[PDB]
Each structure stands twice: as C-alpha cells, then as structure tokens.
Amino acid sequence: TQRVLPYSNGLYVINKGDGYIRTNDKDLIGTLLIEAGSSGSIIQPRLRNTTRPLFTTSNDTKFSQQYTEERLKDAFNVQLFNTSTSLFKFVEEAPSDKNICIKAYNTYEKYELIDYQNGSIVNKAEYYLPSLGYCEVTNAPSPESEVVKMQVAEDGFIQNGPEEEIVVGVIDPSENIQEINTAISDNYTYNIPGIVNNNPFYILFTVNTTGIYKINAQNNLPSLKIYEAIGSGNRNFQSGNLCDDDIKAINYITGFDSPNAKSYLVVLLNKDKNYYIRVPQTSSNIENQIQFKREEGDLRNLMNSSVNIIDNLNSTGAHYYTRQSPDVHDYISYEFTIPGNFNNKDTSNIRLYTSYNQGIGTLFRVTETIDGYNLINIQQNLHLLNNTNSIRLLNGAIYILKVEVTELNNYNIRLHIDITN
C-alpha cells in the first residue's frame, strides 16, 4: 500500500514538521504545579546560545552531518544548527476554581534528506533541528489514583506540531553549474564545453521574454531535464542578462532520467525566473550542443512535457514504451510515425493504451510546413488505461500523443501502440 513517489532522480530535503519530541521524557524541561489564582512561567532565555541537534544517517560517507547541513541550507537557508538567539517562554494563569500543571518540552523540527534513484530511496538522513518548544497544560493530579507500573516505550519521536510535508529538490553539489550569461531570446545554441566532459552537469539560464521554449540536444540525445530555481528573479536584475543568486533549491518541471531515450522539452519559461537544465552522463566522445528555441506556433500545445521520439515502429503488431510516469496532472508526450509508405491512402488501425496508470490523451496529426510544425487535434479525451478503442491513421504519417496523468498507480508509465494491417 506504498504511495508511488513519482520524484525525478535526485536529492530532496523534506520538512516533516515541527514539535517533535523523543519518547520517555528525554526532552522534558519540567513541570510547574500552579495553585489556583496564581501564574507560572517556564523560560528559555538564551543566556547560553547552545542547542543540541539530533542526526541519523544511512551513509556516513556521503550523507555526513556536514553534508546534510549543507543540504538543509541549500533547501531552506538554515544557517544555525548548533546555536540559537530565539527565546521562548510559556505562561499559564490557573483559574480561580482549580490548580493547574504545565509541562514544557524542548522540540525539534524534523528534516529528511533523501537521494531518490529510479523509484526508491538509496540514501537517507534525518536531521532534527532544535525548535521553540511544546507546552501542555493539564488539571492537577489527584491523590493518588494509584501508580501503575509501565515499561518504557521504544526509542523514537512523537509529533506534537501540525501535519507538514514540504518537499524541496536541491542541486547535487558533486556536479558543475555552467552559466549562460546572456538572456535567451528567440534562438540560442549552447556548445557543450570540455571543462565538464562526460560527467553530468547543470546549465543555469534565463529568458528575455515569457514564452514557450523547445529545448533539446543534437538529434534529441541525450534526454535532458529542466528545473526552476525556487524564488529566483525577485531581486537583482540586469536587462538581457542572467543574474545568478546561487539558489540551489530546485523545482522539477519535466524531463527523463534515461539518457538513451530521444526526446525534447517543451516548456513555459518566465522572464523573471532562472532555470537549470541537467545534462546527464553521456558515454560518447562526440561534440554536442544544447539548442533553445522560442515557439510561436502549434508546438505550444505540448507545454509542459518531454516529447519522446519513437523510432522503432516499422512493422505491424504490438509495441510498448516504458518511461518514468509524470505525477498526477503532469504531462508526457510521444511522437511516432505510422509504418508503411506515405501515399495518402494506405491506412492502419491503431490502438493506444496504458497498462496501469490512468491518463487523458489528445492525439495530434503533425505536418511540417515552411512555417514550422503544424498540429491538428484529431482526437480528444482519450482515456488510456486499458483502452480498447482503436482509430485508423495514415501509413507513413506523423502523430503526437500528449498524455495527462490522472491516476498514478505505477512509478512507470507503459504506452502501448498496437498496429494492425
């Protein structure tokens, strides 16, 4: 009954909430018995600034305490781990009727750092950052009830703060960040530099005018991924240039981890924002370029998604294509050519379906003119999961299927293209 985590490969820092305390009163500050009419206070006055974070990791040699702290700083800008100047204090006035007890606890805000790779967690660490306390008030204990003995709880934490799950991607620090210093207009070609050979790397860029862009490597290999720098563009600014604010907190937009899959990105980019492209490890010594192109015509209909180029569709029968599934409400697209000679008459029956995830598809006929690519919407509201409906398409013609995921049942999405005639 595990949630499918449709996260792109990478590092994530997750704020799992505030108000955590350990079991068996390890974080109890103490209890005040306050008599009726009176008041009492428990105070953390920071006469000393020292705090005590707690840390556990699955991998001391990558996710050390230092590294994790650097990640929490990348994600949320946390800078004080060992210290605090933030005071907290709890005050309780007992009612006129009855006596009152207040128990105060130290608390932690829990951060989880994960390395997520191909559908599972491969490195994990938990950093509990000292927080600003928990105060429970209760009626005065009566005599004596009686004392009933109790075994200690297992070691662990109990959350007393509100539910919270804030997921923030972070730049992998082992990878270089290259910059495109000029803001991108209608067209740009980025040559891949030998200073970052073979290793995956990031490209930081920004755009002159808000618009939809197509982005790809030569011959659409390798596949690329694109992220937005969270909170970028709110600050310094220079017309037609990139302003780098060293933001390492990233929101995944679209793109595949499998580098041998041909694809291109179609994405809406804001001029008041910075973006990172990640180019993966390529096992080839040939020169490559990243191409950027502003789209003014029908290709805009494909935002935001990666478009997989399907190449091996040259016989009749069954064909399937497996990719990481987008999350709910996100898109994946497929561009394919119906086998056979294009003679504008010869036709084939085509069945399009998924195996496990539900998705809404729209099918486009593609024709390239001298004015660019044209997309004719020929089929709307296709429900893909175990679809039995079929449609006759032209031999040798080119189609794009755009899929919106609506039910995420499997980490992968498997598109079937079954062709008969």
Partner 1 sequence: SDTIDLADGNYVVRRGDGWILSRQNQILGGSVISNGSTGIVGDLRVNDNAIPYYYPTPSFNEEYIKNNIQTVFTNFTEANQIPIGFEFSKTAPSNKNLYMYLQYTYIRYEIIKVLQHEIIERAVLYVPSLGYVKSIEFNPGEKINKDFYFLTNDKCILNEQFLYKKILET
Applying CB under 5 A, which residues contact Cl ion?
354-357, 413-414
Closest contact distance (angstroms) between CB of 55 and partner 1 is: 15
User: Quick one: which segment of 101-109, 346-354, 358-366, 376-384 binds partner 1 (CB under 8 A)?
Assistant: 101-109
Contact criterion met (CB below 8 Å) for 233 and 286: no
Segment 103 to 132, residues that bind partner 1, using CB under 8 A: 103, 107, 109, 129-132
Contacts of 286 (CB under 8 A, 6+ apart): none
Nearer to Cl ion, 354 or 395 (CB): 354
Nearest to 419 by CA among 264, 310, 262, 331: 310
90 counts as binding partner 1 under rule CB under 8 A:
yes
> CB under 5 to 8 A by kind: which of partner 1, Cl ion, none does 48 bind?
partner 1
Contacts of 174 (CB under 8 A, 6+ apart): none
Residue nearest to Cl ion (CB): 354
349 counts as binding partner 1 under rule CB under 8 A:
no
The Cα 1–Cα 221 span in angstroms is 36
Nearer to partner 1, 52 or 392 (CB): 52
Contacts of 23 (CB under 8 A, 6+ apart): 152, 153, 154, 155, 156, 157, 158
Closest contact distance (angstroms) between CB of 180 and partner 1 is: 16
> CB under 5 to 8 A by kind: which of partner 1, Cl ion, none does 268 bind?
none
Contact criterion met (CB below 8 Å) for 57 and 124: yes
Closest contact distance (angstroms) between CB of 277 and partner 1 is: 21
State how far the alpha carbon of 116 is from the alpha carbons of 6, 89, 139, 301, 359, in Å. Answer: 10, 39, 47, 31, 24
Closest contact distance (angstroms) between CB of 21 and partner 1 is: 10
If you ran DSSP here, which 8-state letter would residue 219 be given? G
**What number of chain residues touch partner 1 (CB under 8 A)?**
88
Segment 357 to 396, residues that bind partner 1, using CB under 8 A: none
158 counts as binding partner 1 under rule CB under 8 A:
no
204 counts as binding partner 1 under rule CB under 8 A:
no
Which residue in 12, 16, 34, 298 binds partner 1 (CB under 8 A)? Answer: 34
Nearest to 76 by CA among 184, 167, 206: 167
User: Quick one: which segment of 95-103, 112-120, 358-366, 383-391 binds partner 1 (CB under 8 A)?
Assistant: 95-103
The Cα 151–Cα 163 span in angstroms is 29
State how far the alpha carbon of 41 is from the alpha carbons of 20, 28, 102, 106, 138, in Å. Answer: 21, 15, 9, 15, 15
Nearer to partner 1, 78 or 419 (CB): 78
> CB under 5 to 8 A by kind: which of partner 1, Cl ion, none does 378 bind?
none
Closest contact distance (angstroms) between CB of 335 and Cl ion is: 19
152 counts as binding partner 1 under rule CB under 8 A:
yes
Nearer to partner 1, 232 or 354 (CB): 232
Which residue in 4, 54, 135, 309 binds partner 1 (CB under 8 A)? Answer: 135
For residue 130, which amino acid is it? P
Nearer to partner 1, 248 or 323 (CB): 248
State how far the alpha carbon of 237 is from the alpha carbons of 42, 190, 405, in Å. Answer: 47, 22, 37
Closest contact distance (angstroms) between CB of 132 and partner 1 is: 4
Rounded (10°) CA dihedral 310, 315, 412, 407 = 100
